[PDB]
Amino acid sequence: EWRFPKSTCPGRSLQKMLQLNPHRHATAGSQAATIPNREPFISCSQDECRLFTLDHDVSTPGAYDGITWEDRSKRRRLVSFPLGSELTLDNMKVHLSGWSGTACHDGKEWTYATVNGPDNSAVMRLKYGDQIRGSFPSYANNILRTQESECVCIDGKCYIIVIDGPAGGTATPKVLVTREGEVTSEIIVTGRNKMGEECSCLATNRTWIECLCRDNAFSAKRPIIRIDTVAGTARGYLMCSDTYLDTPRPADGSITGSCETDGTSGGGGVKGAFALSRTTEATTERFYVRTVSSSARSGAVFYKTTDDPTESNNPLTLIGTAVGGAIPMWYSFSFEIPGKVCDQTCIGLEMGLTMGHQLWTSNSVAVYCVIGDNLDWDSTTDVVPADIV
Amino acid sequence: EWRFPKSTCPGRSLQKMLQLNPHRHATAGSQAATIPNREPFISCSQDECRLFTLDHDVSTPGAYDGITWEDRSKRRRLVSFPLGSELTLDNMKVHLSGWSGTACHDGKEWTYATVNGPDNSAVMRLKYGDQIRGSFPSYANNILRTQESECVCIDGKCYIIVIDGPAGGTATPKVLVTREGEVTSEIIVTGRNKMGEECSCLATNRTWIECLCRDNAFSAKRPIIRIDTVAGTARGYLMCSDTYLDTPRPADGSITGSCETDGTSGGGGVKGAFALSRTTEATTERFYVRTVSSSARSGAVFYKTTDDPTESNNPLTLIGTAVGGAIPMWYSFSFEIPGKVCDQTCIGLEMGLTMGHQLWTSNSVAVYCVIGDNLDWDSTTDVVPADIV
Amino acid sequence: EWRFPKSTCPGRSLQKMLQLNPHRHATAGSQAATIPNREPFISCSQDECRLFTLDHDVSTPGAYDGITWEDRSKRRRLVSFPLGSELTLDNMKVHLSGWSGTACHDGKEWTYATVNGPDNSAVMRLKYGDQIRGSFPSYANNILRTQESECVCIDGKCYIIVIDGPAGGTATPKVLVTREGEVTSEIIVTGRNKMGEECSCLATNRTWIECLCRDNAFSAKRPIIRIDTVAGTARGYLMCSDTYLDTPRPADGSITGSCETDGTSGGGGVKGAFALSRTTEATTERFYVRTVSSSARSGAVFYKTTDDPTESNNPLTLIGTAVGGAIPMWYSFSFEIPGKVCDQTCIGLEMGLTMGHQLWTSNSVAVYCVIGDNLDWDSTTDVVPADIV
């Protein structure tokens, strides 16, 4: 029947599952039509896992693929591939037009959501199975956008974080509550709620959800949103650890003040992710990623903690480097693999590939899951963008 | 069991679902074998939706693709693609040879129909599952042809509009009634029945069907056919609104006379489409498309009304422009997505692509469905036919 | 449960279903890897129909495709494609190595059979589902070979005609009786049994099978084999009609003597096919194909009769020309589409494509089924072998 959160598979670290690298096949002499894309993420039903991403209505090599740097356009679609299929034209499935996306399976059907339209009056449409069952219009009229990673479904309701408002100022997130793709309520996020883009979300137990977000205007600390799906409420916090997770960021521990103090820098950011261990009642361990560099989007390093991230300033504990500091690392995303016996959470890593400013842009995706005792290996792309034809 | 019409999902406007644009992948350097095609449409079972179209036994780029402007030839086939698969050779499924097509799912099996043969003695064959169960010969011996959009199945019987006769004069439509692909009766269309090509058809309630057609000889107003599937009868009308839906057309409201008065121009036309909202007993709102231009096939504009289109001359109400007037827009088609709880109707738009008179010809397909409160965005192709290799 | 012959769908003629033409996609500029092949045929389960053929371990365009004229080699395999999929590399499924093939579904599993090995000691292996369950060795040690069209399964047993012996002399056919792919008996063909290659076989009622074969040494009349699956017996006849079906052949009616008189020419031949109408008790109409030319493999013409073909010399009745006499036509094959209500038989046509003697060789496949009242249209390829790259 309905999907709900189970206790997770035992595991005390992150180890590599797989990597997809389509543009290895886009060199001189190759015969493949690969799909350049950005903002990828994975979502799973109990039958299959799928790689979702936002394409550009074009393949590489190809004469139109010079637009792949744009964030928003009439060409972008939420597409997906079965997880493990390489990212080629024939493997691709188009779900909805739009330039911001999310998707999640509720036990019976896929829900797909994208935002579509001009910056000042965009509309989120939600697709349930084959039908568009929901529509949610822009409420601040300034780039309505969503998670760029999977949403979370519990007991037949799916929970989606949207934000609308300036990228460099106050923009308030909302939680949309959907049943069969129709928006049946909006939860107001209380507490610390002046920012919260591109949230990566996971259930922390049977009835609660925790989202790790990006503050693009005010702070190098990541906002966190917790949802109590029974009470129907959501509260925002600021991640308190001295190990600041956003990029760019100042040195560790140097933001003076309370947990929820912004600090003086804070401009810019990148979507971050986390994974966890849990029982039916509570989360027992958390796993976090951030870049090697504190000013550029390069590298990826893993950390862990058994503390509550909204109320401890202790540094996180180092797991090790998953992408060397010389390698572009951009978004990362959380997801959960439902199982019959236990569930498992994972972090995906968008290893970025680009020829430069407003030139060809795409990525390779590496996946790490909660299992084992030590980090097993770092990941590379071995794709030189100059060699892409 | 059998498919029948349900009440529709709530919705008060048209919003974009998705777009397919295969020839974005047919530029210099690309690795894809795309499928040039015309007269596309979508039909759905409860498991899957499919994009149907008439191909030319060729792919683009390719040395034989210069024939894709022809309407009828021994090369054309009704093919289909899972909806969301891009239109490439490996994704294509061939169903029947022929140069006019339709298809619909009855709850248990696909029915596929095409017309095949020389202009003066063509034969419609109907395929049910894997077998050809029905054959219907030409009765006026002058291009037997059909809807170029999905047929409608109710309680195990499927209803198909055919026409046979001169393109610039009187040609009488018939309704074929099929059970498992075998033609078990013909309903005579009474009333206004001297034309009626390329009908887009939707159930208006539990037991009635309404088709919106093209008068190619006499009128800029669109013919409408209503079928009472219980009584086994069909009656033709002329759409009465001052907002004439065909192309070319005179200015709005300027056809003098009764509802069913032709007007003085009327030569030519294009296949049009509509969508609707309904309960089990009656249709509550209708949605219509026409071109921006009143003399060329360019642009697409949406309208709506709560009036009966066969008995009111009130202008329709503007929803907005879905394809800018500078963009070729050709056929459009209706279809319905069956759901477990509710059904949903949609309009697809054939955005035409061609190098010129008797040169390479194909299209991009944009899809809008009944949902939400306002139009979300217009569609473009960003394909320049000169760049197609 | 098990497959058995049902009464057929009503139909009094042959009308076109579809055509596959992969090498339309093998011209200059094309992006497809098409599969050159020969001896194709179709076989169906109740879920799906499939196009089987013998490939050459190569695709076109390609530097190794110059071997596709060979009849037998270590490169050839029995491969298949879902019926309606075009014949490209990614759509292909390899079943067994070998250079003579057949396949049929028994209601539960596919049986696949090929002959493999050197001319003087070849072995037929039979694959049932995923396993090789049967092996049948050469008994005359001179090119053991089989039908190159589907076999027939009745009540859990499948029936396969093999021949072994000189191509220009006496070679006796056997009927192999298989259960789950294991050869459980051999039926000796009595009567007229000195030749019988490449048999096209169809059930004539609930318990009998009729095969139409090729005499390569002695006669322009086609041999016919009837199998009584209950009694476990098979008897050979010579087709008696004045309308000789093989190529080359003398003029109609000019073979003097009894039904089973060879006539003076008779050297050479081509695989022919037939279709039929039947009830559970008896065959009511037969449909036959032969070439337009009486000396070359060009064109295809349809005929019918309600007579017993082993005991009447009446000419057959003309249906019309399905492939014009200027178009190469090579093998043709019978097959049957099982249905829940009724079955349907069909003829496929191998429209040959070649650059010349021991150069590139392949084909296009056109399909006609028993339905309707008149022939609907002839078929062409519009492939010029010189344009294949």
Add this chain to the structure above:
Amino acid sequence: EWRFPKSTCPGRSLQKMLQLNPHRHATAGSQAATIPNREPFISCSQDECRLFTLDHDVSTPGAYDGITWEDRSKRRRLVSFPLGSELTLDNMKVHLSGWSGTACHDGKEWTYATVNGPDNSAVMRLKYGDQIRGSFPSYANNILRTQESECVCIDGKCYIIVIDGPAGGTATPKVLVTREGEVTSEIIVTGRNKMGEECSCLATNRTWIECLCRDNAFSAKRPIIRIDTVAGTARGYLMCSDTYLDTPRPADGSITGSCETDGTSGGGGVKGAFALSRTTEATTERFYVRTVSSSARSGAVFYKTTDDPTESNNPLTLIGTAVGGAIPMWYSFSFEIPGKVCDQTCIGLEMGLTMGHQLWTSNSVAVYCVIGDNLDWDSTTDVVPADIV
């Protein structure tokens, strides 16, 4: 329910099933993106058989395919293809990153295992369905590696041989016992246990497994490991027959001493394979492969015996040559096709293709199964590596 070993299909020899040869499609003019690979093997569930192999994150033709000679790198993944699909990019499924692999189906789910990481601290991860359920770290810190052929599942537990330690000295194998992908015990291999790489494993009856391995340091005789899955024990032996199966090897019978005497040469080796006939209680016949040459990896020859291979020095009995001595032959692997009535074992042959030392490297795969009475035909590739583009 659970998979367990059945009695095998009757058969007294090895006959060819099929061959996959993707790089036939990688010549000048071809349109295919083929997948260069090494260490392939086949594993089957009751629904499907699959070809597994270790890829290099690249396709051929292509500018990055010059790395395909490396044994271990961050690019390699365990991928698979449905058996009979040709080895192209669109057909490929990625399961896990890593450079040593194995996989087996337990009746309900696939288990996939790879080793990943640096030479001195590699980690085996095990994937069960969609989840990584098991992790097993390196215990000798010197290239943890596994079978490169299918594992064996009996009554819900799967058995995997791993080895860790020097390639030219003593390295002790362990048997990992897995349930739903989690390592629930390790069986210590007693007896002759100082080597044992790349084991090909088959059940010998209802409760016992026999593995045929490679001694890379000490002996031209192959090690054999037997597992009693009920008692939970494993014992190593040295294959005693005078017909030494490894490459390179001295002349037959010339190793002086007991069964378990190494002999004086013994350096180097290749993965070998075997097939068998069995009842529920015991193995009745064994089938073995080795190269034609006793110093190079070229050719393949089949043998059989009804003796116990750990306790008889009798020569094996010749079946015949499956790959001529002029053709590179590298790894071979065992696998078993589960059936509803009977099981069947087979040998696959990695026919190697390479341009030379540290240049492009891949293979063709030929498959032989236990059936029939005599060998049917030898296999070739007819791929000249110089012609690969």
